[PDB]
Amino acid sequence: GAPLVTGTMVKVNVSMPEVAERAAATGADGVGLLRAEHMILSIGQHPIKFIKEGKEEELVEKLAEGIEKVAAAFYPRPVWYRTLDAPTNEFREMPGGEDEPEERNPMLGWRGIRRGLDQPELLRAEFKAIKKVVEKGYNNIGVMLPLVSHPEQIREAKRIAREVGLEPHKDVAWGVMIEVPAAAIIIEDLIKEGIDFVSFGTNDLTQYTLAIDRDNERVAKLYDETHPAVLKLIKHVIKVCKRYGVETSICGQAGSDPKMARILVRLGIDSISANPDAVQLIRQVVAQEERKLMLEAARKQL
Amino acid sequence: GAPLVTGTMVKVNVSMPEVAERAAATGADGVGLLRAEHMILSIGQHPIKFIKEGKEEELVEKLAEGIEKVAAAFYPRPVWYRTLDAPTNEFREMPGGEDEPEERNPMLGWRGIRRGLDQPELLRAEFKAIKKVVEKGYNNIGVMLPLVSHPEQIREAKRIAREVGLEPHKDVAWGVMIEVPAAAIIIEDLIKEGIDFVSFGTNDLTQYTLAIDRDNERVAKLYDETHPAVLKLIKHVIKVCKRYGVETSICGQAGSDPKMARILVRLGIDSISANPDAVQLIRQVVAQEERKLMLEAARKQL
Amino acid sequence: GAPLVTGTMVKVNVSMPEVAERAAATGADGVGLLRAEHMILSIGQHPIKFIKEGKEEELVEKLAEGIEKVAAAFYPRPVWYRTLDAPTNEFREMPGGEDEPEERNPMLGWRGIRRGLDQPELLRAEFKAIKKVVEKGYNNIGVMLPLVSHPEQIREAKRIAREVGLEPHKDVAWGVMIEVPAAAIIIEDLIKEGIDFVSFGTNDLTQYTLAIDRDNERVAKLYDETHPAVLKLIKHVIKVCKRYGVETSICGQAGSDPKMARILVRLGIDSISANPDAVQLIRQVVAQEERKLMLEAARKQL
Amino acid sequence: GAPLVTGTMVKVNVSMPEVAERAAATGADGVGLLRAEHMILSIGQHPIKFIKEGKEEELVEKLAEGIEKVAAAFYPRPVWYRTLDAPTNEFREMPGGEDEPEERNPMLGWRGIRRGLDQPELLRAEFKAIKKVVEKGYNNIGVMLPLVSHPEQIREAKRIAREVGLEPHKDVAWGVMIEVPAAAIIIEDLIKEGIDFVSFGTNDLTQYTLAIDRDNERVAKLYDETHPAVLKLIKHVIKVCKRYGVETSICGQAGSDPKMARILVRLGIDSISANPDAVQLIRQVVAQEERKLMLEAARKQL
Fold it and tell me: Which residue of A has its CA nearest to B292?
């Protein structure tokens, strides 16, 4: 009759706006990552081509209803939304995708907030839709920027967003993703530009730190998300933003692992984001770890 | 099978004596505020006119049964009752309400315990009914005075109550409401007159502190119950009565807000009073905040 | 043959630009408050209606000569001018005042710098006239904003003034009024926006702190300007701006009271503003209090 | 053009209500002692006989106008009034004074507040007249009790005054006279009953301390008001009420002496009360003594 209650927050990873009731029925504390790849690449057309042709309002209002569905399934609870992020060999395979670079390394190329700031129209449209669903009365949304490594990117994004009416820290929440080692090493510079939350992308971080591709058959035997270097980086970041009053979280595939959950609860993370069918297991693991910590402190005191 | 258990008490706000079983079925720890406006203004007549005509015992015994209903729905649990409080443009609209002042500011006028002490017959009748339901064997009632700003008001009320048989601190509990900034700034003087409990009226306090009416369309955009000044005042009050051994609580519309609940549990309030359809949400928010605090202390110790 | 000399400054309260020689003949150290209600509401017309019709320059130059008269009667001495402040039931009674709200509480409504920032044309005209009389060579004027409770109001006023040529802190002085309890409780936030002086409106402060209207016959028996809470607030404010190097003053009806004068000189205020026929009495009271303080310190030392 | 200003207050001794403009024209800071012997013994009749006959209201209203005259000649300034005090061989010489005791020592007999508390009708009438002139709007009056040596006298006087409507410490000031050595030796007990001011009767104190009558030709060669014992007593009293926050003063014939003025200013008295033709001399002596003290402290510091 009574649910299980933990101090650490356990959230859920929403992929499409159609799996949102089965996710709200799991007992999660919010949405940890709602991706936009589907909601944007569903119109069977290159978005840059789609807007040159000139159909902006259709895409805008479609995004608006897609976002409001999820926002209203979990209202009192927070929802975090990450702007578009896909490689260049993902835009090549759509009607209108004929002009491409066929790069030799699409993992270290033109993607994420870099491409976003080069063509500010995608950012304009997404911020328009977000403000659109905000003015209906949903005050539980926040924005997440992917692949940040210089503070100039944060400031230019804030300006682009402020030109079209949206207001950071008073209409939404402003946060970033940590996936490049540089961002993990100079985290204080990024914090000094006024952010609210941070999230660990352990997939990309583990790949860029060990200089290894996971899809390659010959070197995927070295992949490991509990390697000492990644743990040093995570510990440093958590320490600093704890000191500055910022909230920490982790999404990815290592959010659904019991061993990583134990490590992260012993270090002091604020939230964990799990796949829709792993929320109960992680809830139990976190509860047990917390009771262990409390017992240890009681014994030391007595 | 087992209910959810929190250290902080979560109570419920009862409006009429007819919604009292649906409220006792929520799992609350008591009643936080039972208003008398309905039970008194239900006789379709001006009460001062009603008693000049001379029908005192009817009103008395009606109040008596109205109060005993609620007191017996939640017996082992405490119930707190607030004496009459309504503006002057509320007595004007009843049969017998022809002699009025049509003031220019009914919010800063003749109402509450001021008007009550001017015409001691209302106080006499209410204290009579309260003692009436007390002598049947209900020892879980307490009295709450609205809009207090001088200790003389507390002493005159104690005398008026002691003349007709009722005895403070041995038959009931004696407490006050905090709605004017003056009462929040000289709280120790009020405590030195022997009270037992205090309650925050955050609606009136926020309105009188910012010099702003909320019903006015042009300046209601500035209303905010988490403004720094109100929080400073609340923190000061809680500190002092914690030092003196007095119990604190909060009623209003901000008792049903998760963000305010988190702020207040981190400061150290003793109880929260919620609307009858918000008890479960506040219960969950309070449980999570308490587990967070305990984990933080364990980590600091280890 | 020699005038009486005090360390504390004693100023005078000027109501109209016609009583300005009888005021300069009292021996005051400056003007403490020059109101604009008369100089603006003298054209027998609603000012918003007056400017829609389109007669801006007439009102501007009339204000200009009205201000220059007072500024030139007391040149070496400072003069402080407070922008328009009147309730809504004061604009209703003029030709053109037909569109009104008939509010239920005009004391907590749309007035002062709130209304001023809603319709920036009044501010534009007043700042134009002030700069007009400044460029003739009068460098002893300063501007005072009424009813401030957020720093955003100060910043928006500074911007509005800087758009039309006037320059704070280099052409005039910039200061505020303290009448809402919120402004007295977060005074440091306001100081951090670069102000030069502050002034206590003890009338409005005493009314908003005790939640009491003074014009109401039934509750005017509780009004008191030496109530402990108001004195706590005044002491806090004086302490903080003393620490930050800002000048303090007091206008109102309690500036012409000997008992308040003694309290305020013992606390350490920088100036007092009296009615034109009470300057000599306050001068004597202040002189005696200062000699008392000096004697006490000498005795403690010896 | 500028008056002389001292930290110590110099007041004046008013004997009748007819010499009150020549006294207000001296530049005094208030009245230090207004006697009632004249205003009461002017009806050519024994007052106890006058009230048995039954003419209370005539005497009451006569006192009322006599007091209001003086109170309105010095309004902003305080006035202190001492209840009736005369020996028994002063009531013997009036129409109706036939029943007397012809005592052997009328200086140590039935007089002052003793006789006053024995026959409470005189106190009733005087307090009635005082409240009468108070309710016209004069808030600068205070009451002084003569010849007090037990706290029971103070409490009984407070009760007698509170029965007929007058309220100590909220309508008037409450103070006492110090003339018996006992009162000077247990001063703290008297202070703990809530008084506001004290005054030295150096005539009676010097006579009762040295066990000497001054009117007697053979032993008046030993009278001296600067005898070491009286000075010890004065120093003790001043010390204690300084510690408790009470105001001190001195009336009598030694208030008009330059040498005593210098002694008393060096000890730290708050006020001095002089005869109507000695105010200027005492003003000059006090000014010189204060400048001397300040110079001494400056030299010690440098």
Answer: A7
CB contact under 8 A, B299 and A290: no
C297–D5 C-beta distance less than 8 A: no
- Contact state of C284 with D1 under an 8 Å Cβ cutoff: no
> For tokens 């008269």, what's the residue?
C69
10 Å CB burial of residue D44 (0-12, 13-18, 19+) is exposed
Report which residue type is found at C188: E
Which of B4, B291, B299 is closest, CB to CB, to A268?
B299
Give the span between the Cα atoms of A161 and A158, in whole angstroms: 5
Closest partner CB to A2 (pick from B4, B288, B298): B4
Quote the CA–CA distance of B257 and B234 in Å, as a whole number. 16
CA angle B146, B150, B156 (to 5 degrees): 75
What is the C-alpha separation between A110 and A133, in angstroms, rounded? Answer: 30
The alpha carbon of residue D300 and the mean position of all alpha carbons in its chain are separated, in whole angstroms, by 38
* Catalytically active residues of B, by annotation: 251
3-state SS, C224-268, equals: CCCCHHHHHHHHHHHHHHHHHCCEEEEECCHHHCHHHHHHHHHHC
Is A296 close to B302, i.e. CB distance below 8 A? yes
* B250, B264 Cβ separation under 8 angstroms: yes
Cα(A248)–Cα(A268) distance, integer angstroms: 9
Question: Could you give the 3-state DSSP secondary structure of residue D279?
Answer: helix
Which residue from A139, C47, C183 is spatially nearest to B181, judged by alpha carbons?
A: C183
Resolution in A: 2.9
Contact B2, B244 (CB under 8 A): no
Residues of chain C in Cβ contact (below 8 Å) with chain B: 89, 101, 103-110, 114, 118, 147, 149-150, 179-182, 185-186, 189, 207-213, 215-216, 218-219, 222, 227-229, 232-233
> Is there contact between A and D if contact means ≥3 C-beta pairs under 8 Å?
no
d(CA A144, CA A168): 12
| D5 to C258: CB separation less than 8 angstroms, yes or no | no
State the pairing for strand pair C271-274/D9-14: unpaired
Q: Return the SS3 of D37.
A: helix
* Residues in chain A, total: 302
**Backbone CA torsion sign across A198, A203, A205, A206:** positive
- Among residues C261, C273, C226, the alpha carbon closest in space to that of C33 is found at C273
Helix (H) / strand (E) element for C166: namely: none
Contact between D8 and D271 (Cβ < 8 Å)? yes
| Helix, strand or coil, per DSSP, at residue D251 | strand
* C251 in active site: yes
Report helix, strand or coil for B257: coil
Chains that touch A (3 or more CB pairs under 8 A): B
Distance to chain A for B97, nearest Cα, Å:
42
Chains in touch with C (≥3 Cβ pairs < 8 A): B, D
Distances from the Cα of C56 to the Cα of A132, C59, C121, C129, angstroms: 40, 6, 10, 11
Catalytic entry in A251, A269, A272, A282: A251
- Chain B closest-CA separation from residue A13 CA (Å): 21
Interacting residues of B131 by C-beta distance below 8 A, sequence separation 6+: B164, B165, B166, B171
Closest by CA position to B269, among listed B200, B201, B174? B200
Q: Cβ of B300: how many Cβ atoms within 10 Å? A: 8
d(CA A270, CA A260) in angstroms, rounded, equals 14
**Interchain pair C298, D294: CB under 8 A:** yes
Based on its alpha-carbon atoms, the radius of gyration of chain B, rounded to whole angstroms, reads 20
Torsions phi, psi of A249, nearest 5?
-155, 175
Torsion (CA) B231, B233, B234, B237 in degrees, nearest 10: 160
Q: What is the DSSP letter of B172?
A: B
Q: Which pair of tokens denotes residue C152?
A: 């955003």
